[PDB]
Amino acid sequence: ENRIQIMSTIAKIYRAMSRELNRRLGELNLSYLDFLVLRATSDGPKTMAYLANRYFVTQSAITASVDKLEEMGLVVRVRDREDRRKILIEITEKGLETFNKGIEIYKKLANEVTGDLSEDEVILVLDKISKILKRIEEIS
Amino acid sequence: ENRIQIMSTIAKIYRAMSRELNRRLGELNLSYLDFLVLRATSDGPKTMAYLANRYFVTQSAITASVDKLEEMGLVVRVRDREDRRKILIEITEKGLETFNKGIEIYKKLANEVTGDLSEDEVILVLDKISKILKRIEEIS
């Protein structure tokens, strides 16, 4: 039953990675969720609804993370000049600096956990799981 | 940056799979967590602490899921005959029946989402990600 084993192993990796990323990001004063909000906003401003949908968390959780990052100086709520109800979450310069530190933590951990795989094996794995992602996102 | 891409894709697959497994398991009156408690107990009784640790959820969440499954007739709390404080969560016959229905739902979804991969590609992916699991669980 290899196909279900792929999926359950994926889940087990995510859970353990989550715990460890939370631990290591904690030194940057971030949770894994906070880091995901920085990753999302690092390439352009995002709506709160997008953040909750894309990363499969509640509206309340996003609100809490955005409020935190806002207090920390890492994101701002930008309001449309005609209708201030239209809000985007925009990363600040400090938010980018902290995001980039987070990426380096993530890279070092990824390098540890994938260390038994050659660069070639890494590439073989990545291209195939990308197809699994495309399909589940279609079904979702 | 392929190694971090493997890990972020793993996370994205887990999130989307979680949402869809919750939806499809809901027809069996189960959450994904409830199903994980059945999977864990299906091969022998488990402590509550084991369930929270193994599946990276809070004690309160396990308590809520076990209490639910207990009301549903799917698990029992078994107490040691000399020290009734020592509790194991044991699956019932009905719990096994419902677990097996859950496994079939999981298999059908796994088959959908991995459908672009040949059996051979499935095997190549599975053996390599098993090594990633071993390492992150060591680090965790």
Tell me the residues of chain A between 26 and 65 that have a Cβ less than 8 Å away from chain B.
55-56
Experimental resolution (Å): 1.5
Q: How far is it, in rounded angstroms, from Cα A104 to Cα B121?
A: 31
Q: How far is it, in rounded angstroms, from Cα B16 to Cα B133?
A: 19
Q: Is A18 on the interface with B (CB under 8 A)?
A: yes
Residue A106: strand, helix, or coil: helix
CATH topology of domain B1-140: Arc Repressor Mutant, subunit A (1.10.10)
Tell me the residues of chain A between 75 and 134 that have a Cβ less than 8 Å away from chain B.
103, 106-107, 109-117, 119, 121-126, 128-133
Q: Are A9 and A27 in contact (CB under 8 A)?
A: no
Q: Are B133 and A27 in contact (CB under 8 A)?
A: no
CB atoms within 10 A of CB A119: 10
Experimental method: X-ray
In 3D space, the residue among B8, B125, B132 whose CA is nearest the CA of residue A107 turns out to be B8
Q: Which H helix or E strand runs over A131?
A: helix A119-139
Phi-psi region of B66 (alpha: psi -120 to 50; beta: other; left: phi over 0): alpha
In 3D space, the residue among A100, A110, A109 whose CA is nearest the CA of residue A41 turns out to be A100
Q: How far is it, in rounded angstroms, from Cα B72 to Cα B70?
A: 5
Q: Which H helix or E strand runs over A39?
A: helix A32-41
Contact A20 B136 (CB under 8 A): yes
Query: Given A4, A20, A140, which is nearest B110 (Cβ)?
Result: A4
Q: Are B107 and A4 in contact (CB under 8 A)?
A: yes
Please give the C-alpha separations between residue A41 and each of A72, A99, B52, in angstroms, as whole numbers. 15, 10, 33
Residues of A in Cβ contact (< 8 Å) with B140:
16, 19-20
Give the residues across from A78 on adjacent strands.
A88
Kindly write down the DSSP assignment for every residue of chain B, as one continuous string. -HHHHHHHHHHHHHHHHHHHHHHHHHTTT--HHHHHHHHHHTTS-B-HHHHHHHTT--HHHHHHHHHHHHHTTSEEEEE-SS-TT-EEEEE-HHHHHHHHHHHHHHHHHHHHHTTTS-HHHHHHHHHHHHHHHHHHHHH-
Residues of B in Cβ contact (< 8 Å) with A20:
136, 139-140
CB atoms within 10 A of CB A127: 12
In 3D space, the residue among A85, A88, A59, A84 whose CA is nearest the CA of residue A75 turns out to be A88
Q: How far is it, in rounded angstroms, from Cα B31 to Cα B27?
A: 9
Q: How far is it, in rounded angstroms, from Cα A14 to Cα B14?
A: 7
Q: How far is it, in rounded angstroms, from Cα A76 to Cα A85?
A: 14
For A105, nearest residue in chain B (alpha carbons): B4
Q: Is B136 on the interface with A (CB under 8 A)?
A: yes
For A52, nearest residue in chain B (alpha carbons): B15
Q: Which H helix or E strand runs over A90?
A: strand A87-91
Which of A114, A119, A121 has the most B C-beta neighbours within 10 Å, making it the best mutation to test the interface with B?
Answer: A114
Breaks (C-N over 2.5 A) in chain B follow: none
In 3D space, the residue among B8, B138, B13 whose CA is nearest the CA of residue A35 turns out to be B8
Contact B117 A128 (CB under 8 A): yes
Residues at the binding site of A for Ca(2+) are 138
